[PDB]
Design a protein around this ligand. Structure first.
Ligand SMILES: C#Cc1c(F)ccc2cc(O)cc(-c3ncc4c(N5C[C@H]6CC[C@@H](C5)N6C(=O)C[C@](C)(CC5CCOCC5)C(=O)O)nc(OC[C@@]56CCCN5C[C@H](F)C6)nc4c3F)c12
Ligand SMILES: Nc1nc2c(ncn2[C@@H]2O[C@H](COP(=O)(O)OP(=O)(O)O)[C@@H](O)[C@H]2O)c(=O)[nH]1
Ligand SMILES: [Mg+2]
Length: 166
């Protein structure tokens, strides 16, 4: 069993740091580099391979990019709790996913990262309300302390399994 997971969101939210915590178990990363990793995990008793695409690069839209994004089975929509503009951008990323997947119910999880920082600008309640409006889970994370990291990825695999049952 394999799951193709894609991590999206604004520059500097922690996409690479969350990916590296899951894959390499340490808190680290060249902001311009887009790369993929695999990890074998057991989630709710099921062994699976997670393929994680950590997105980066210039904002560009093309047939090849719409094709690389379309292969994602589930998406983490990551914002940083100290960056209001990254939270405001979440609607854009959710819309792009829905556009390339040609579907209204693509597996997604809303992730509020940098939960260890004291300089919060986005309240937990604003994020919970946004996730409820989308019908998706909201997970608070810190790539620095590892709070919520496995929960964000594993919850996205559970969202994919629920979608496969429909
Ligand atoms: C995600 C997607 C997507 C899906 F999910 C699903 C399907 C897709 C299909 C595609 O064809 C295409 C995409 C898709 N690719 C890329 C996107 C993107 N990138 C990509 C990443 C994320 C932000 C920035 C630019 N990125 C960076 O890596 C920025 C840095 C690290 C900055 C460096 C540069 C050197 O100097 C120091 C800083 C960089 O290397 O350029 N930015 C935006 O939007 C940004 C906002 C803010 C400004 C205006 N713009 C419109 C809204 F207002 C939001 N969207 C993107 C996008 F949709 C999708
Ligand atoms: N304190 C703290 N810093 C983080 C956390 N996640 C990422 N960072 C830092 O924020 C910056 C951007 O992180 P990065 O992973 O490159 O973001 P990306 O551009 O979304 O890939 C780096 O300096 C990271 O070390 C976190 O949860 N807490
Ligand atoms: Mg990165």
């Amino acid at each position: 069993t394999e799951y193709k997971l894609v991590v999206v969101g604004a520059d500097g939210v922690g996409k690479s740091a969350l990916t590296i915590q899951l894959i390499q178990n340490h808190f680290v990363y060249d902001p311009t580099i887009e790369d993929s990793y695999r990890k074998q995990v057991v989630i709710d008793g099921e062994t699976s391979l997670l393929d994680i695409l950590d997105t980066a690069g210039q904002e560009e839209y093309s047939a090849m990019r719409d094709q690389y994004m379309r292969t994602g089975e589930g998406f983490l929509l990551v914002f940083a709790i100290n960056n209001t503009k990254s939270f405001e951008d979440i609607h854009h990323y959710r819309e792009q996913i829905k556009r390339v997947k040609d579907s209204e119910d693509v597996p997604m999880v809303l992730v509020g990262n940098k939960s260890d920082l004291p300089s919060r600008t986005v309240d937990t309640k604003q994020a919970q309300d946004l996730a409820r409006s989308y019908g998706i889970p909201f997970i608070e994370t810190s790539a620095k302390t590892r709070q919520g990291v496995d929960d964000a990825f594993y919850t996205l695999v559970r969202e994919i399994r629920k979608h496969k049952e429909k």
